[PDB]
Design a binder for this molecule. Structure first.
Ligand SMILES: [Ca+2]
Lengths: 478, 88, 153, 233, 51
């Protein structure tokens, strides 16, 4: 390259052809030579005809050359038109990346990936740099993407969105090499977003919390705090800035530097809101309403309501359950109607992904068993129906009581252990598999050796399944 | 004896692994409850249906400068963090 | 210990109220509510296997028919004077409860104890020989005789 | 046209941080071109970062003959499209006759510099007198004329770098012969058009430059780390 | 030789998995495969990939 540039320079007519010199030093990777012998003297530039060499440096993966060009000046939105995007997505976009994209759309759909599938269907036939960053990031370019990312305004949003896209494209099982490098680049950009937001929080907290909540004119149609959730970027939320934001949103008006027993004690004694024991930093009637509007104490009120509901259901179910419904059964029906309205309101504000969480599924299931208990309970004078309704209410009380575990996941002390509890299902299933194998292999052998031709189905399963099951608690089959 | 005390060992190993991920997953789950409780503008729960009627009342009747200001604030620490990368 | 007691109390109440409601009918004595809802599922943690659910090994010599003497009430009878509760809903209920408390929930407490012993051992000697100062100072603060004569001093 | 390599980027960012930390004015050309553009950018960045604690002062001094759109009021105007820079908070444009006349702004500028150099403000550790430092890093006639008009006056405190066009020929040599053979080895591509009848005057300019070399200091190439701007000034 | 580290690497594992599934692509969920095993004339439907 240096020999060809020395012969290309000393013809003494093409010295004015500095464009040919720059193109020659672009086809080879001479960065230092072009920087020292083209841009140093500042005698000649226009900052507008540098677009063909720009497009060539972009399509042929020249990141140091585009860095040296942008250091001396070019505006990217002036550079980009829709035709350049159609040339990039129609010709320079690979077909194997398209195949992995369509397999990922078939197997792993999401709102951001639906959005990028819609826009790639757009540009294979108002935010220029973000779309060029997307084109850079789906190709696993890994070095041009940094160069354009340093030029963006909404930087953390772009980093989190790129991390989401690459984590979703890394789950495709064919072409494992590309999935590996996309996984590497996804880890790189989630680390980059975390390490930028820690500085943006560690200088000015208020403007960092201004940054967290902006949608940036429908970047991907979402928010910076939502993109970490949708990618399950749980390290971005585990950092103390977002935790401080969430805790200050959780307590609300109450300052965090008061002890919480004072808060629940002020909840118990309602006219003690007007006393110097709690700080409302973050007139008196405003103190009253700002207390009864906080999320912490409305949750702490709803759990007391729920425990009182469980005690009322227990009293009705065990001690006062007659042929006609008495007064506490009617009060119970009113409370279940209030819970039913709250759950159907949460379903209407949530949609179809409401059935994603299993807790909402068993809440709907419990409400359905409750109304089944009502319609079995109202057909009076049939003792079979009036007993079956109470059996349905007992099997429903089991569900409503086991909801309390999910209710108390918010605590600082019980919470992480309850979250840990769901990581144990595979060991329980391994135990149950081996114990079921030993159970059957012992029970059938003992039943066949002892007795002769049992014809009753109930005393097959009481002697094959049930007694070797009890032999796990130390019964020693007699 | 064997099959129960093996379950104890597998529980102990699983508790040994997931504890450094435990706080991360818990304070990730904290976001969902904070957002689902702050999404509602309601009264205390036993009167919520009345406030629900208030929404039924609703159903009976019915580029920016500081944005670029805080983005231009963000770019300063972006450049500072790029210096902090290339300095070390 | 508090996490274990919280989960065990939840499973205890959810089993005891369901079993008392399925078996019997309108207990009016407060003592035989808490002996049958709280106390017997509590004993089922030490491997007792609550007896009143089998419908073949249930005799009427331990009943009362009305709250008159000590013993619990009967399960509510048929028109044929037979027990009404289904075995196919109370046998697997006792099986699921007995699995979920006597095995999973205790052997989880063993694992959490083992992990906590694994952490605090390098802090253990530091905290112990920090506590050594207080007893040395509270015993050296006194100029006394042996204890049975201290009142004289 | 202006090339801004990242060492100069770090130097001038550190400089404007120093000018905020000390509460200083910065006098500049004040146009929308290259170096003055980037100085205005860093002024805007230090304004948008802290928003208070002595918003810094940048006076641009322009010629009024180069400005594209000029609107006479008493009533604020709008300036869209030399071109004036957007981010200098004060602008002074010298008056003259016709338009195409450079170097008109230098006389009033250097007279103002001498007046602050004789102006005494007691609350400083210089014995009053408001200390003044002049920089130059680029090339051309105007840099040499400004440095010599400053050094002919007392106390310019001239600081130069070892990077640029005229910065190299001032940095490297520390009579006429060495001026010639360093000027041709570092800048042939401007002297290709220039007659010797004013190059002898340039040798006179640099002869007045190298008279008081204690009033001239340089930022060298090994001295390229942090805090090198405080160590020069 | 029982060189189990040579077989634990993802190349030989990818080879063995692609030999194990056979005609079915690995990027389909296995419940679809056993559900197509249960309903025999559901082999002719776009739920499994025979790539
Ligand atoms: Ca719910």
């Amino acid at each position: 390259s240096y020999a060809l540039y020395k012969a290309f320079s000393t013809n003494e007519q093409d010295k004015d052809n500095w464009n040919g010199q720059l193109k020659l030093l672009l086809e080879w990777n001479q960065l230092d030579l072009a920087s020292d012998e083209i841009f140093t003297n500042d005698r000649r530039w226009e900052s507008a005809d540098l677009q063909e060499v720009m497009f060539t440096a972009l399509i042929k993966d020249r990141p140091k050359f585009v860095r040296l060009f942008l250091e001396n000046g070019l505006n990217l939105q002036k550079f980009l038109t829709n035709e350049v995007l159609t040339e990039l997505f129609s010709t320079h976009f690979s077909t194997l990346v398209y195949r992995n994209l369509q397999i990922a759309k078939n197997s792993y759909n999401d709102a951001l990936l639906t959005f990028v599938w819609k826009l790639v269907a757009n540009f294979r036939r108002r935010h220029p740099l973000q779309a060029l960053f997307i084109w850079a990031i789906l190709q696993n370019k890994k070095e041009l993407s940094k160069v354009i990312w340093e030029q963006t305004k909404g930087c953390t949003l772009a980093a989190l969105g790129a991390s989401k896209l690459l984590k979703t494209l890394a789950k495709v099982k064919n072409d494992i090499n590309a999935a590996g490098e996309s996984e590497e680049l996804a880890n790189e950009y989630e680390t980059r977003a975390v390490e930028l937001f820690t500085e943006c929080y560690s200088n000015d907290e208020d403007l960092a919390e201004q940054l967290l909540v902006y949608s940036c004119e429908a970047w991907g149609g979402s928010n910076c705090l939502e993109l970490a959730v949708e990618a399950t970027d749980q390290h971005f939320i585990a950092q103390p800035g977002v935790q401080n934001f969430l805790s200050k949103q959780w307590y609300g008006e109450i300052s965090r530097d008061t002890k919480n027993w004072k808060i629940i004690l002020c909840l118990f004694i309602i006219p003690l809101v007007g006393c110097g024991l709690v700080s409302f930093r973050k007139k008196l009637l405003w103190y009253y309403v700002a207390f009864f509007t906080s999320p912490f104490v409305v949750f702490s009120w709803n759990v007391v309501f729920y425990i009182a509901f469980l005690l009322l259901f227990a009293y009705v179910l065990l001690m006062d359950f007659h042929s006609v419904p008495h007064t506490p059964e009617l009060i119970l029906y009113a409370l279940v109607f209030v819970l039913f309205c709250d759950e159907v309101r949460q379903w209407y504000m949530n949609g179809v992904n409401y059935f994603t969480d299993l807790w909402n599924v068993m809440d709907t299931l419990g409400l359905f068993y409750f109304i089944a208990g009502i319609v079995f309970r109202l057909h009076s004078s049939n003792k079979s129906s009036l007993y079956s309704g109470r059996v349905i209410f007992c099997l429903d009380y089991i569900i409503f009581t086991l909801r309390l575990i999910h209710i108390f996941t918010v605590s600082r002390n019980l919470g992480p252990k309850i979250i840990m509890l769901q990581r144990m299902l595979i060991d329980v299933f391994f135990f149950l598999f081996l114990f079921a194998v030993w159970m059957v292999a012992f029970g059938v052998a003992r039943q066949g050796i002892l007795r002769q031709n049992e014809q009753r189905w109930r005393w097959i399963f009481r002697s094959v399944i049930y007694e070797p099951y009890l032999a796990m608690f130390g019964q020693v089959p007699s | 004896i064997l099959l129960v005390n093996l379950l104890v060992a597998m529980f102990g190993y699983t508790v040994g692994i997931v504890q450094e991920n435990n706080d991360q997953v818990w304070k990730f789950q904290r976001y969902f409850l904070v957002q689902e409780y702050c999404n509602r503008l309601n009264i205390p729960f036993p009167f919520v249906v009345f406030a629900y009627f208030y929404m039924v009342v609703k159903k009976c009747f019915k580029f920016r400068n500081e944005d670029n200001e805080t983005l231009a604030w963000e770019g300063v620490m972006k450049e500072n963090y790029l210096v902090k990368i290339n300095t070390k | 210990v508090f996490f274990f007691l919280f989960l065990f109390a939840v499973w205890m109440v959810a089993f005891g109220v369901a079993r008392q409601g399925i078996l019997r009918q309108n207990e009016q004595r407060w003592r035989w509510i808490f002996r049958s809802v709280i106390y017997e599922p509590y004993l089922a943690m030490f491997g007792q296997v609550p007896s009143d659910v089998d419908s073949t090994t249930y005799d009427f010599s331990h009943c009362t028919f009305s709250g008159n003497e000590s013993k619990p009430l009967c399960v509510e009878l048929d028109e044929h004077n037979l027990p009404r509760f289904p075995e196919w809903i109370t046998i697997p209920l006792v099986c699921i409860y007995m699995l979920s408390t006597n095995i999973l929930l205790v052997n989880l407490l063993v694992a959490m104890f083992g992990y906590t012993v694994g952490i605090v051992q390098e802090n253990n000697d530091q905290v112990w020989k920090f506590q050594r100062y207080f007893l040395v100072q509270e015993y050296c603060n006194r100029l006394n005789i042996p204890f049975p004569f201290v009142v004289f001093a | 046209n202006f090339a801004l390599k990242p060492r100069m980027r770090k130097i001038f960012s550190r400089l404007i941080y120093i000018a905020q930390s000390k509460g200083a004015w910065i006098l500049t050309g004040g146009t929308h071109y290259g170096l003055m553009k980037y100085i205005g950018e860093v002024v805007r960045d230090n304004t948008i970062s802290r928003n208070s604690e002595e918003n810094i002062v940048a006076i641009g001094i322009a010629a009024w003959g180069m400005v594209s759109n000029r609107d006479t009021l008493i009533d604020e105007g709008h300036f869209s499209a030399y071109i004036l820079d957007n981010n200098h908070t004060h602008l002074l444009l010298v008056d003259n006759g016709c338009h195409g006349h450079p170097t008109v702004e230098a006389k009033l500028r250097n007279q103002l510099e001498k007046y602050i150099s004789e102006r005494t403000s007691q609350d400083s550790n210089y014995g009053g007198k408001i200390p003044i430092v002049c920089f130059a890093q680029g090339g051309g006639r105007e840099t040499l004329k400004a440095i010599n008009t400053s050094v002919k006056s007392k106390i310019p405190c001239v600081v130069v770098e070892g990077s640029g066009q005229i910065a190299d020929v001032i940095a490297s040599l520390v009579t006429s012969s060495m001026v010639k053979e360093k000027l041709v080895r570092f800048l042939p591509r401007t002297v290709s058009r220039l007659p010797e009848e004013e190059i002898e005057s340039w040798i006179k300019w640099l002869k007045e430059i190298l008279e008081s070399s204690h009033l001239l200091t340089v930022i060298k190439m090994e001295e390229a780390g942090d805090e090198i701007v405080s160590n020069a000034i």
